[PDB]
Amino acid sequence: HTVRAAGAVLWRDASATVEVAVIHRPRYDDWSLPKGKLDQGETEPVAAAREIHEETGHTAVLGRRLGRVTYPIPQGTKRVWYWAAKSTGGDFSPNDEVDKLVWLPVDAAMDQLQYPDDRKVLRRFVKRPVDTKTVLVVRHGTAGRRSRYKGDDRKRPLDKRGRAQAEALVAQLMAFGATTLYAADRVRCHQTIEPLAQELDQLIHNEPLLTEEAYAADHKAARKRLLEIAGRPGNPVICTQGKVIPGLIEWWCERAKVRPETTGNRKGSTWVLSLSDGELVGADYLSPPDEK
Ligand SMILES: Nc1nc2c([nH]c(=O)n2[C@H]2C[C@H](O)[C@@H](COP(=O)(O)OP(=O)(O)OP(=O)(O)O)O2)c(=O)[nH]1
């Protein structure tokens, strides 16, 4: 009864001079935003990136989440999550669903879009900056129980499910154009982004200030380190622990007056922090890749 989809406001810098992509589908003779249904096991961001490529022929990097829409379809209810997405390459070619694509300034695109829920999404897009950089704060994957581990608990490794979460995070974090890697000084934090390190061929920088013990004793040192990592070129992944993340996220959202639409703290979850000129403009919580 409820069909789950994901899509994007794909934009390009025409010089940044923002134009957004609007696609035409012969089946309905309509103009809309690229989007499609989630495949089995696929997360919303991974589906959004795939649909951009399938419907527009562009590669893109997702940025800020633009909320969700719900509308009735003959089958019941369509529910779609949307992202801002910056084109990074490729080109349009016609496909089974799409015969035309136009690139328009936002005011012209608003007039071209015929569905109310697409115009609501485009309004969300123009409300805040879209040429953003992204900090990806990841809680390490499942690693069994402290109680049932003999050895230094710092060496406690991911369990099978956690190793699978770590593999599933590669497509999720590459959808946001991850480029640099940071982990708290715990094996289970490093192992979570080990698969991404191999995909990027990139080293993980160890972070002694971002462990639970270090955070609990010196919040301020951890906040300063987060802002320093965030200031460096690239889109950093920071993998840390359950008693660290809520504190850091809540502190930054209060300071920037940013209200997260979703929240949680599960093992394997990701916070997508969107920055524009050093200011937080979005804080998007993504469930673990193996959970709804
Ligand atoms: N794309 C889109 N279609 C909408 C919106 N509002 C609305 O009533 N519709 C209509 C168009 C169709 O009559 C119907 C189903 O269209 P759809 O695009 O959601 O579904 P679909 O299965 O054809 O396509 P897709 O999810 O595979 O991309 O819903 C909207 O905001 N966007």
Ligand SMILES: [Mg+2]
């Ligand atoms: Mg589609």
